[PDB]
């Protein structure tokens, strides 16, 4: 590990600096180094890890979608052959994306999840496992595609089960998990009705619990509730 010689606290500090500088690849490398110190992560540290990799993989996904669209158009009837280059470059971006997902999943499996006993940490990591298997599923086409989808589903389901037992329905981790699992159902599992049902039930159960919250918690929860409503509007 290229970060093995740097203090854990220095890695965390530099991750925060990298975030301010919008250097998300650096931020992800620093947080990977911090995880590899072997200690559990605090809530703030978990969010630095997730922000870093979400931005890295989000850029890769956006690029993959552009290239996939060009490739599909190059393969339509009447298109002029342009050679192997579009496929090759889409494959290059795809392989880099898969590498990032494998890296995150590797951190979760060695050993973040197994040491995470509190609901806030364990649900957060299982949500991340579902998300990164979901990103693998977006690009998957081979013998293992169904197993990739099922790995995402299984991680999301375990996170959901814990969240329903241990967290209030307005907890922002629980809300974001449900938002993302609902998107998994719509876009990956070809289950739009399940996606819509989950988003609606999540929104309504959160609504009914808002009365318990402070102003700041209310803002956190209603932000994610608005995303649930945005998706419901897109889908209905």
């Amino acid at each position: 590990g290229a970060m093995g010689s740097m203090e854990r606290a220095s890695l965390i500090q530099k991750a925060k600096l990298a975030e301010q500088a919008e250097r998300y690849e650096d931020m992800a490398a620093f947080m990977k180094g911090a995880v590899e110190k072997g200690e559990e992560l605090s809530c703030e540290e978990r969010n630095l890890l997730s922000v870093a990799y979400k931005n890295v993989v989000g850029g890769q996904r956006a690029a993959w979608r552009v290239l996939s669209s060009i490739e599909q158009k190059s393969n339509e009837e009447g298109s002029e052959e342009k050679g192997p280059e579009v496929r090759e470059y889409r494959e290059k971006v795809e392989t880099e994306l898969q590498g990032v997902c494998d890296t995150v999943l590797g951190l979760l499996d060695s050993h973040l999840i197994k040491e995470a006993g509190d609901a806030e940490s364990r649900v957060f990591y299982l949500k991340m496992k579902g998300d990164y298997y979901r990103y693998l599923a977006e690009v998957a086409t081979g013998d293992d595609k169904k197993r990739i989808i099922d790995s995402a589903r299984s991680a999301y389901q375990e996170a959901m089960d814990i969240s329903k037992k241990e967290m209030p329905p307005t907890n922002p981790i629980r809300l974001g998990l449900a938002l993302n699992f609902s998107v998994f159902h719509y876009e990956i599992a070809n289950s739009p009705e399940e996606a819509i049902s989950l988003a609606k039930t999540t929104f309504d159960e959160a609504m009914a619990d808002l009365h318990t919250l402070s102003e700041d918690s209310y803002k956190d929860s209603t932000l994610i509730m608005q995303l649930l409503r945005d998706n419901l509007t897109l889908w209905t």
Binding site: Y186, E187, D230, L234
Partner: peptide, 5 residues
């Protein structure tokens, strides 16, 4: 695309 966090 739909929203995720």
């Amino acid at each position: 695309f739909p929203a995720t966090v």
